[PDB]
């Protein structure tokens, strides 16, 4: 499947197809781990991965996660379609950093978008307002234990 797609459905950095180096090596390793974790429907998953019919809701159903989680991952990574495994792995790592912190993907996006510049010396001061800070803290803390 990878060779038939010609690394187009795999994605590449600054090169056509893919150069034999550490970036493509790590990408292939993570892709193989994802294929191993696919499960029983992994055969059909790769089947429409050969095509361009692998939809976000189908991926959500196969992985067993939440469709709203997948959608907020889409809107956070900025990709409207799983054109390449670069986009796929970006979405997967966003989901991973959301799940590890037990917090919503848009909350992760808000945390990343914090330009902590505090009156210039860099791009701009993206510091949220007071109530925005309070709401963000509530959202990121809402998923903890009792003790």
């Amino acid at each position: 499947v990878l060779v038939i797609s010609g690394f187009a459905v795999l994605g590449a950095k600054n090169q056509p197809a893919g150069q034999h180096n550490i970036d493509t090596l790590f990408s292939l390793y993570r892709f193989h781990q994802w294929i191993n974790g696919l499960g029983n429907p992994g055969s059909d998953t790769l089947d429409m991965l050969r095509q361009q019919t692998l939809t976000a809701d189908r991926l959500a159903s196969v992985m067993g996660l939440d469709i709203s989680m997948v959608t907020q991952a889409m809107v956070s990574a900025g990709v409207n379609q799983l054109q390449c495994w670069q986009d796929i792995n970006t979405v997967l790592q966003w989901i991973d950093v959301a799940s590890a912190l037990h917090t919503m993907p848009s909350v992760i996006r808000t945390l990343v978008n914090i330009r902590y510049v505090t009156a210039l010396n860099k791009a701009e001061s993206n510091l949220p307002s007071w109530d925005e800070w309070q709401t963000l803290a509530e959202n990121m803390e809402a998923g903890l234990s009792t003790q």
Partner: protein
């Protein structure tokens, strides 16, 4: 206990503090809260809901029902779809219908634990639904049936003989045990007529 209308939409920006409190109390994410609202049928326009103690009690009852049976919200939705009480809202559960649902759920969970079957697998093997498109196994069945057998002998009149002829191909495409078991599965599927 204020009665104000708040939205439980996971995609809703600026989530209500009461919504977050309900999320933390139920211990389920926003998507599972939306699924619980869908199951309860108390959903409104823009996935809103009035903050009323009756609806809160209904949601907490659903959560306790899932917890006592050791099942998640999605699995609860699947078993509700497979249950005879499917297509009904939790509000539309009478004082005698709720205990019936409880006892049915308990017996189903006990038998499922005894049989040692997972949740999505039992969903697939209990519902008559489909995956959504043609599977690679179906494509292989087509590619091994069109060449091997043509209409010449397939256009016979004996349905049982046609089933016998098609049985080895069905066994090959389903990784089955024996051609006769493939034939008997064909007999089930023909007496059922899914499509």
């Amino acid at each position: 206990a204020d009665g104000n209308t708040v939205s439980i939409d996971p995609d809703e920006e600026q989530s209500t503090f009461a919504r977050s409190a309900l999320m933390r109390g139920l211990g389920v994410n926003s998507g599972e809260l939306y699924q619980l609202g869908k199951l309860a049928g108390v959903l409104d326009a823009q996935n809103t809901i009035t903050l009323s103690v009756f609806v809160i009690s209904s949601l907490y009852r659903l959560t306790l029902l899932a917890r006592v049976h050791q099942l998640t919200v999605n699995e609860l939705c699947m078993l509700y779809g497979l249950s005879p009480f499917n297509g009904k809202t939790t509000a539309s559960l009478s004082s005698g219908e709720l205990p019936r649902l409880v006892i049915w759920l308990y017996q189903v969970t006990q038998w499922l634990t005894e049989a040692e079957i997972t949740t999505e697998a039992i969903w697939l093997l209990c519902t008559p639904e489909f995956s959504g498109n043609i599977s690679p196994e179906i494509s292989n069945l087509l590619n091994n049936l069109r060449p091997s057998i043509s209409e010449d002998m397939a256009q016979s009149h004996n349905r049982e003989l046609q089933a016998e002829i098609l049985a080895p191909f069905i066994a090959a495409t389903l990784h089955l045990a024996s051609p006769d078991m493939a034939r008997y599965i064909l007999l089930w599927t023909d007496n059922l007529r899914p499509g």
